Design a protein around this ligand. Structure first.
Ligand code: HEM
Ligand code: 9PL
Length: 463
């Protein structure tokens, strides 16, 4: 009655069928044998796996409510423990998601306000990139300081100074955690956390980075409590603390300190790491494909010029830039197995029985690379989202933010960030790799919870 899958052994589950260094490939290799919907055992953790566009959409959209429960990511749940928007369920999820979405809008997300903040911030990236004097540099922290400063703008009330040593520290913590969760040890941790959380190893270093990010948030919150004005909120934290006051006589309220610290931490991490990684992978992809970079320059110079900052409405007159970013996201596949979902109830799904609480892995990478939706799925080719005529061609398999009821509500900010950061860098600079185009490896360095591109250096040269 459960979907078919390979026979597990007691406790270790399907250990013998999985290579934890390549979870995505192992699962895809299993899906080739069993079909697109299968049951896998991550140790004693039973998970149903959805591969391909049709399986992912049929579950997450066509049966949206049923598949709207949140599952586990054990590394991250070490600190969160079900608190905060991302890892919450039921009433807690309803309440925090509604609040988060509305308070981000109040602070300019999808509005003129945040567009101005992003333009300013891009401005500061531009100056910082000129300041290398065309140097061969690691762009990791330049990109990530810039990106993080936007969400930090919204949640903490001010940006970080690029020279701030504590800022760099947090960014290393973030990079560190995503790194770990995409290593074989990270993925074994997903299978055997109840043992491994008590064992020395890279787990312990990852928990310590998570604890450092937690301590920094709770000290930012403590500061806000001590200085709050209930009639003029400075930031997201302020808004949340005001609601905590209004709610202190509701006995069943989800608005309390632990949910504030953990939601704020979801936002800070969310709004920092994915867009940053996307950009870094982006500049690698473009350096590997000079023909695509040249076509980008052409369009920016024609539609925008050189005399001003790019804006968000510029998107509508720029078919090719939209297709490069969509293709960057589709190739990049930054979060390849989504965040895990779970069935809210005993559930019937295309002739299988899913008991209440069964964890579900929507293989977003299998949709981004579904050969029914994309011609040569393993090639970076911006034409994947283009008319024969050259107009922007959408895709139902374009799913890097997932779909359904618990879909990324950061999509709006991220899309605005990607566009303005990519064009404003492209307008002001051309990209020059440390090796020739043919010797650049664009294959990932780590794939697990995230797709992590290889360490590289590059140069930014003015036009
Ligand atoms: C390149 C950019 C981004 C990518 C690829 C991405 C990807 C994802 C994915 C795959 C999920 C899981 C959704 C699901 O379970 O169906 C998610 C959820 C989430 N994301 Fe993002 N995201 C991005 C940007 C952002 C930004 C900028 C923020 C914060 C401003 C953010 C915050 C969140 C939050 C809070 C959730 C939890 C949704 C929920 O459980 O209700 N993300 N994102
Ligand atoms: C594993 C959950 C991570 C967290 O703490 O909150 C969001 C984050 C994952 C994520 C979702 N959207 C972008 N990111 C980087």
């Amino acid at each position: 009655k459960l979907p078919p899958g390979p026979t597990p052994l007691p406790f270790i589950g399907n250990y013998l069928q999985l290579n934890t260094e390549q979870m995505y490939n192992s699962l895809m290799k299993i899906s080739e044998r069993y079909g697109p919907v299968f049951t896998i055992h991550l140790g004693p953790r039973r998970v149903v796996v959805l591969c391909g566009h049709d399986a992912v959409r049929e579950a997450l959209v066509d049966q949206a409510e049923e598949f709207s429960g949140r599952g586990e990511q054990a590394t991250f749940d070490w600190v969160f423990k079900g608190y905060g928007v991302v890892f919450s369920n039921g009433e807690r999820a309803k309440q925090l998601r509604r609040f988060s979405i509305a308070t981000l809008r109040d602070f300019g997300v999808g509005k003129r306000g945040i567009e101005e903040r992003i333009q300013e911030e891009a401005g500061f990236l531009i100056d910082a990139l000129r300041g290398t004097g065309g140097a061969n540099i690691d762009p990791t922290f330049f990109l990530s300081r810039t990106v993080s400063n936007v969400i930090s703008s919204i949640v903490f009330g001010d940006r970080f100074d690029y020279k701030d040593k504590e800022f760099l520290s947090l960014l290393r913590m973030m990079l560190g955690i995503f790194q770990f969760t995409s290593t074989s040890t990270g993925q074994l941790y997903e299978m055997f956390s109840s043992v491994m959380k008590h064992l020395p190893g890279p787990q312990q270093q990852a928990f310590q980075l998570l604890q450092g990010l937690e301590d920094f948030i709770a000290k930012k919150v403590e500061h806000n409590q001590r200085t709050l004005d209930p009639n003029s909120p400075r930031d997201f934290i302020d808004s949340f603390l005001i609601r905590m006051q209004e709610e202190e006589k509701n006995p069943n309220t989800e608005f309390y300190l632990k949910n504030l610290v953990m939601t704020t931490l979801n936002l800070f991490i969310g709004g920092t790491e994915t867009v940053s990684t996307t950009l870094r992978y982006g500049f690698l992809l473009l350096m590997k494909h000079p023909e695509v970079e040249a076509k980008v320059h052409e369009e920016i110079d024609r539609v925008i010029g050189k005399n001003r900052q790019p804006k968000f409405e510029d998107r509508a007159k720029m078919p090719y830039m939209e297709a490069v970013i969509h293709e960057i996201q589709r190739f990049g596949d930054v979060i390849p197995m989504s965040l895990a979902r779970r069935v809210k109830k005993d559930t019937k799904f295309r002739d299988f029985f899913l008991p209440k609480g069964t964890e579900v892995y929507p293989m977003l990478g299998s949709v981004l690379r579904d050969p029914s939706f994309f011609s040569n799925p393993q090639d970076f080719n911006p034409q994947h989202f283009l008319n024969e005529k050259g107009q922007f061609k959408k895709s139902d398999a374009f799913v890097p933010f997932s779909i359904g009821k618990r879909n990324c509500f950061g999509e709006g900010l991220a899309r605005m960030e990607l566009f303005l950061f990519f064009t404003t860098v492209m307008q002001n600079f051309r990209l020059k790799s440390s090796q020739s185009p043919k010797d650049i490896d664009v294959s990932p360095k780590h794939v697990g919870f995230a797709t992590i591109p290889r360490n590289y250096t590059m140069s930014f040269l003015p036009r």
